[PDB]
Write a protein that binds this ligand. Structure first.
Ligand SMILES: NC(=O)c1ccc[n+]([C@@H]2O[C@H](COP(=O)([O-])OP(=O)(O)OC[C@H]3O[C@@H](n4cnc5c(N)ncnc54)[C@H](OP(=O)(O)O)[C@@H]3O)[C@@H](O)[C@H]2O)c1
Ligand SMILES: NC(=O)c1ccc[n+]([C@@H]2O[C@H](COP(=O)([O-])OP(=O)(O)OC[C@H]3O[C@@H](n4cnc5c(N)ncnc54)[C@H](OP(=O)(O)O)[C@@H]3O)[C@@H](O)[C@H]2O)c1
Ligand SMILES: NC(=O)c1ccc[n+]([C@@H]2O[C@H](COP(=O)([O-])OP(=O)(O)OC[C@H]3O[C@@H](n4cnc5c(N)ncnc54)[C@H](OP(=O)(O)O)[C@@H]3O)[C@@H](O)[C@H]2O)c1
Ligand SMILES: NC(=O)c1ccc[n+]([C@@H]2O[C@H](COP(=O)([O-])OP(=O)(O)OC[C@H]3O[C@@H](n4cnc5c(N)ncnc54)[C@H](OP(=O)(O)O)[C@@H]3O)[C@@H](O)[C@H]2O)c1
Ligand SMILES: O=Cc1ccc2c(c1)OCO2
Ligand SMILES: O=Cc1ccc2c(c1)OCO2
Lengths: 257, 257, 257, 257
């Protein structure tokens, strides 16, 4: 295959969950930049519509619908609509929508636990199940989970969050092996702290920000496009022998003494 | 500290969940063998009572009550009874009770997912929360989770099982760091296939057994005491600088090419 | 930075050791395909000339000289010539040239050990030292080591080979943290078996080929461009927050049960 | 096998390199405490004699000779003498003697590199080869390498040191799989900073001490017996299903955020 085709997503179809802000928004734009047709969602109709209008103004081929991926019935309805829009063929599934709670282990409620498991683990698992027929039908499938680099280390307050992301890292391995025969690859990107609306209150908390940045060799938090570029690469034919991997995008955070 | 005291559990108190069969039964006996007073549980009153009678006949200091650790209210009642019996001081918590479903990713139901999360992950998490005061009050605490070596590799059918155990491996790291200041250590033992009542149908399935054993350098499945010995060691003062680790007891399975 | 610029190597200079065959040849072509000017080397003057003539006919900008990177004095001469050719500014260092011996542990000689350490570990370490000023001067330096996926698992015959690659994987982490202050990133690519006629490698005979085919979920060995693409990506501005990582390119080999 | 027998080293013979100070001295004492007969060595005849006299007064069975394990011919002479003393039957090989240099990457000399590879990697590899017949003859052989927790993270100054320990960690896996057929198990213990007056090590000065104290959740460096206990355990019948593992003994250092 030519270098040009190996580094392109021209003609492909993609579903990115949680695409109106932060990393997901950057992933939508990165995939469109390499020629993908993209479907996205969020929980907020007004914000999603504005995003879709902005993208249509820019001639970006993006469509979408409101979906709370923590709801089983909404996931079912999303997968049905995505299959209808893309005529049953999906090249790319990016499980980006997630959730976060920061508390000491002693403080987590049953509701905190169920919230994090549903949005970080069950959502991705069930969406993978639902998308398997159209990923297989595309003939070339790529699943990317957005995990977290803290699923390899212990950050104060992150116990249940990191545990659900560690579950995602293992699921990545099972998906990669079980669905290889369908020409579907599965990988996880594990970011460090990234500048997004989800981390705006963290950036305002200078004591917390400075402590985290002091552990990053690069001396700064990441930017959304520093995650999105790798997400696009992992979907390209260039990545055809990369499957089952968890790749940290963290400026050296996890390996820093 | 003397070698004798560093390799002893004399005077300690311990809670082992799921102690009537398999690995948990071997852990109860190993801890008692080093002088621990042990509390255990299972879901089956008749089998638990027979175990407790057998142990009393042998002069093993073991008590227990019926508890389904997948139930929030039963966990609360267990922790209250354990605290009452041990006068508020618990040296050792072994989270051994778990559950297992083997299906292709495509086949898992919502109920399979919720079953495995509740019994493998939420049970251990909540019991750790409930036991934290008495672990702290003991002055020297040790938590051991029984994970699985398949939380590092992809075994067909193990997707949700391995993912919940991978969550346990990460939780091990968070517990180890957050509660170090309370002199509590937390580690995980990750067995390969072990000969237990839980694997009896697997051993009858010679095609499945032979395939798994062909991947084990040692050419056999493990025995329960090969897990229980390490569980006892990790609770001894000898293990005072070991915390946050996931140790595979698998005959070389996970590292075998 | 625009998408086009983040995914470009225009204006960069690169040193790739061992570019005359196998993975290294594909890495040279991939870098030139994104606009890099490349310097390469090998021990075989005739093969090096033939490669350089072919790239000149293709209008690629590739330079080279004969160098045995297992020799300290030849590495010093190589680094001085590269610095002269590129006016003391080097964006990219790819340590690709390696050595391979396949024997049981009992069979390795002192010379096998010295051979493997010199070319797989010492050469990369010393070349990094020698290239540090040029890499620092570029302002966006990228070091890529080519390791092996077998630095995480045990493959028959691979003991010393895999051990030197495990050393490279750790060196990657030290380089990433010590030289982050110069905006030099260091990462390792760990291939599985790659189709490489003319190099002694992973696929030593039909038994090794059949073994790898059976253990890779995709049921095939990799192609050189499947490693080279990731090498190019890791050098692009798109990879600006990725450092200290060991990324397996092995079709799922190491994580497959 | 009874509990008492599974936790005993009665009737075993052991070779521990570098038993005159630091961790190795504690390992000798721990092995003798469980009934092992031990052979040890060092380069300092006066220190070796003083240690051997002290153990004789304590009625421990320890033998030794002067040996520089960085020398191929001296390793051959050591293995021949050990085989003579133990009549060709060795239960335990502990590769403890090491070397340590702390410099920035830019500062390492060719001699530093050769020094560290010879004692941390080549010595252990060649001693394993030389001891294989005696270990096989025992029927229950156990090899323990002493690695370092910094083979998983980047500590300032540790580049070549950590890299040689990363090589040891991989060699552990190859030995575990290749020699499982002889019932020889191989594992690595990876300590964090251990209080070791009289050896050049992790704690090079007050800045290193303060750093490690700040990064260890337990807020302290380790003690030699905290490594030695695990070394003894890994040699006991209790550890019969544990092989190919790298176990960190670091108070949580490597996994602490
Ligand atoms: N930022 C970091 O530092 C960081 C670090 C590591 C990992 N991550 C992971 O990166 C992923 C994205 O994080 P981010 O920081 O970019 O988050 P963010 O800025 O909060 O943006 C999240 C996006 O997802 C949508 N979303 C949230 N919950 C949803 C649900 N239940 N259903 C559908 N959409 C939902 C949000 O829109 P609505 O709220 O309108 O639905 C929004 O579009 C998450 O999985 C996160 O855990 C982030
Ligand atoms: N055996 C293996 O190959 C293997 C491998 C890797 C990991 N593991 C892990 O090892 C642990 C023990 O496994 P095992 O093979 O020894 O299992 P096992 O033979 O089935 O025995 C399980 C014990 O736990 C009790 N138990 C089960 N569910 C329970 C619940 N909800 N509440 C309280 N007790 C419960 C059982 O009694 P009742 O049913 O009467 O309650 C029994 O006493 C599990 O966490 C398992 O996932 C096992
Ligand atoms: N299946 C695989 O091929 C495989 C799998 C995993 C990892 N890897 C790793 O990937 C890298 C490339 O592997 P490869 O198989 O393509 O080839 P290789 O045999 O490692 O390297 C061959 C290239 O390097 C040159 N070379 C070798 N030794 C040299 C020396 N001392 N000085 C200068 N140049 C030298 C060769 O040319 P001359 O011989 O003419 O000098 C040739 O251009 C290596 O690090 C290898 O260990 C390969
Ligand atoms: N904080 C720590 O101390 C630390 C942390 C992590 C890992 N480790 C590892 O743990 C092991 C023990 O470390 P350590 O600090 O206690 O001591 P060390 O300096 O590695 O070893 C000292 C012992 O080995 C002997 N020795 C050294 N080089 C030798 C050679 N070439 N031939 C024969 N004997 C030799 C010494 O006696 P002579 O000098 O008299 O020969 C002494 O008995 C080493 O592998 C070390 O790398 C240590
Ligand atoms: O979502 C919030 C968040 C904050 C800090 C983090 C992080 C996520 O991952 C590594 O450090
Ligand atoms: O519980 C059942 C079970 C069966 C096979 C396994 C396993 C667990 O862990 C590694 O292989």
């Amino acid at each position: 295959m030519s270098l040009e085709k190996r580094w392109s997503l021209e003609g492909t179809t993609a579903l990115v969950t949680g695409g109106t802000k932060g990393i997901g928004h950057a992933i939508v734009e990165e995939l469109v930049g390499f020629g993908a047709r993209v479907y996205t969602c969020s929980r907020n109709e007004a914000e999603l519509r504005k995003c879709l209008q902005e993208w249509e103004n820019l001639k970006y081929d993006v469509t979408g619908s409101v979906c709370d991926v923590s709801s089983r019935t909404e996931r079912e309805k999303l997968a049905e609509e995505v299959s209808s829009v893309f005529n049953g063929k999906l090249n790319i599934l990016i499980n980006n929508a997630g959730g976060y709670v920061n508390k000491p282990i002693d403080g987590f409620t049953a509701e905190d636990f169920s919230f994090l498991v549903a949005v970080n683990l069950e959502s991705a698992f069930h969406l993978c199940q639902l998308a398997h027929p159209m990923l297989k039908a595309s003939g070339t499938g790529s699943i990317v989970h957005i995990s977290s680099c803290c699923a390899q280390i212990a950050i104060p307050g992150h116990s249940i969050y990191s545990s659900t992301k560690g579950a995602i890292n293992q699921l990545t391995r099972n998906l990669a092996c079980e669905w290889a025969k369908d020409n579907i690859r599965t990988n996880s990107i594990a970011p460090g702290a990234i500048r997004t609306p989800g981390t705006e209150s963290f950036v305002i908390d200078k004591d917390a920000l400075d402590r985290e940045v002091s552990r990053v060799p690069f001396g700064r938090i990441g930017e959304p496009e520093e995650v999105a570029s790798l997400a696009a690469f992992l979907c390209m034919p260039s990545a055809s022998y990369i499957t089952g991997q968890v790749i940290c995008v963290d400026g050296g955070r996890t390996i820093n003494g």
